[PDB]
Each structure stands twice: as structure tokens, then as C-alpha cells.
Design a protein around this ligand. Structure first.
Ligand SMILES: O=c1[nH]c(-c2cccc(NS(=O)(=O)Cc3ccccc3)c2)cs1
Length: 124
């Protein structure tokens, strides 16, 4: 069973746009999205579709790149660090739910390396 997906808007939360957040959408996310290993991470985990009935028994802070993309498009984040934390949650969730060496983990590990390469330098 699937919980509601994470919010992509919140009227109580202040919005912001920064050069670094623009870069996270235009360069970082949109490049990762095109990687051959991006597909499992482009939408929230669908536990019914994927037959993972224990996914949300284990993962209590789900995150995916579809959600991150919508948040960036919404100017949902206050700063780049907040967005970077969502990417890190996404990767960590994968390592938590699975086992070292699993195919899905190899995919997340490759994306994480590419992500780190791209966020090493952000615009000023
Ligand atoms: O811990 C995690 N497992 C997954 C996972 C595992 C097995 C299969 C899938 N398939 S899927 O991405 O939902 C289906 C899909 C297939 C093609 C394009 C976009 C999505 C995801 C994402 S995070």
C-alpha cells in the first residue's frame, strides 16, 4: 500500500529562487535524469506496482527525482542545501531498503557519484 507522495508545494513554507537552485534544476537534475540508471528514481516508489509491500514499512522519509524536480519547478526550496538533502535522502533510502551489491544499489551508487561530481562546484 502506497502513502501519499511527498508534497511538492506548501503555502505555509516560504519560497526562494537562487542561482544555485536554478543550477540544481537546469544542470544537475536534468543531466542525472538522462542517465541510463535514472529510471527507478524518476517517480515515487509504487509499492503496489513494483510488488514491494514492505517498502514503506521500512522507508519513512521517501524521496525521488520526480518529486525533487517538481519542488524545484515550484521554487519550493529555501536554498540549495535543502534540495541536496532530498537527493541524499533518495540515495540513502535505496541503501537502507536494499543490500550491498544489489542491482538497484549499483544504480544508486553510480548516480550518487555523478551527483557529487556536479555539485562539487555550484555557481556563486
Ligand atoms: O529502493 C528502490 N527500488 C526501486 C525500484 C526497484 C525495482 C523496480 C523499479 N521500477 S520503476 O522505476 O518503478 C518503473 C519504471 C520503469 C521505467 C521508467 C520509469 C519507471 C524501481 C526504486 S528505489
Amino acid at each position: 500500500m502506497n502513502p501519499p507522495p511527498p508534497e511538492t508545494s506548501n503555502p505555509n513554507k516560504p519560497k526562494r529562487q537562487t542561482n544555485q537552485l536554478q543550477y540544481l534544476l537546469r544542470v544537475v537534475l536534468k543531466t542525472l535524469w538522462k542517465h541510463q540508471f535514472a529510471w527507478p528514481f524518476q517517480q515515487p516508489v509504487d509499492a503496489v506496482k513494483l510488488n514491494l509491500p514492505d517498502y514503506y514499512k521500512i522507508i519513512k522519509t521517501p524521496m525521488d527525482m520526480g518529486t525533487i524536480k517538481k519542488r524545484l519547478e515550484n521554487n519550493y526550496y529555501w536554498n540549495a542545501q535543502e534540495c541536496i538533502q532530498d537527493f541524499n535522502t533518495m540515495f540513502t533510502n535505496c541503501y537502507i531498503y536494499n543490500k550491498p551489491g544489489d542491482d538497484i544499489v549499483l544504480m544508486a551508487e553510480a548516480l550518487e557519484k555523478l551527483f557529487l561530481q556536479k555539485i562539487n562546484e555550484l555557481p556563486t
